[PDB]
Structure formats: C-alpha cells, structure tokens
Amino acid sequence: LQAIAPEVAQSLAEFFAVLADPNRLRLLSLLARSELSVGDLAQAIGVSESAVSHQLRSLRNLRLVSYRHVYYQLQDHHIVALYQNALDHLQES
Amino acid sequence: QAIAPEVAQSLAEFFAVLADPNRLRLLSLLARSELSVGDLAQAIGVSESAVSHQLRSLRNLRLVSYRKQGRHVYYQLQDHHIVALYQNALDHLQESR
Ligand SMILES: [Zn+2]
C-alpha cells in the first residue's frame, strides 16, 4: 500500500508540533470543557490579558482554536476528538 | 480546571513523538493493516533499521503495539484512541479551509 505523501506528512508534523507545548495544552484543556472569554482563560491559567491573547491569537492561525471581549472555543469536532483521545489514552497509564 | 502541569508535560511529550513526518508515514500505513518492520520498510523505501529506530519512540509512548507470529513481528495502532487521533488530525488538515 501507500503511505501518505511526504508533503502531507510534513504538514501533519507541523500541526502536532504546535500541540507539543505544555502551556498551549493547558489552554486547550480549558476550552475542552466550554467556550470561554479571553479573561476567563487568563484567570484559570492565572496570567494576563495581553498574554492569553498572544497565545490564543497564535493558536487561531494554527487552526486549533476559533473566536467571536472575545470568546474562544476548540475550532471544531476534530480538535475536540483529538484532544480527548490523546488525553484519555495517556490516562490509561 | 486546566490539567496539571505534570500531565501537560506528558501530553506534550506524546505529541512531540507525533511531530515527525516519517513516524506519521509509518502510522498512515498501520492505520490500514498490521504490518512488519519489513513490510513497513518496503512500502516507505528505507532500511528497516530506519523503521525500527522510528518505531522505538512510537512504542515507548504507546502509539503502536505489536504481536508475534512465528518469526514475524506485526505492529498495529495501539488502540482506538490512536485511530481516532490520527484520522481526526488528518481530516482537519485536509478539509474546508
Ligand atoms: Zn488508548
């Protein structure tokens, strides 16, 4: 059979790389339970406004999160499924 | 909530393994069929020692498991979490905008 194309692999690689950051993953653990404002997230991570709004505004262009203060959510059902499966599998321990 | 720092770090380490093109190419194959290192190496066009070396961290972080059949060792996606992780990340990559 065929492996996915090298270009497809490299992009999929780049997408997992952004997930390979514990601070990002902390934000996403919050968005996993509900949509939340720019300041509700900062108050959970116990940091600032102008800095949650740096990381989120990063994750937006990465396609992990979306926004409508602003409200953030997990972009869509792939993101939700991906975060949960990863975190349940790690939990099996 | 927010997951604990320790838990976030372990999860970041799981995802770091997935952040390599070659390992993801291996996973794309195991997604359809349990395969040997020999089957894997033929399909990708690399040495076998090259596969085995890539498979190590896939084993250690439990992305893949293996069975023995006589002298053959056959690898699979560890479980349904791995199938979903993979498929969902590929579909989100190839979708919509
Ligand atoms: Zn699992």
Ligand SMILES: [Zn+2]
């Ligand atoms: Zn998607």
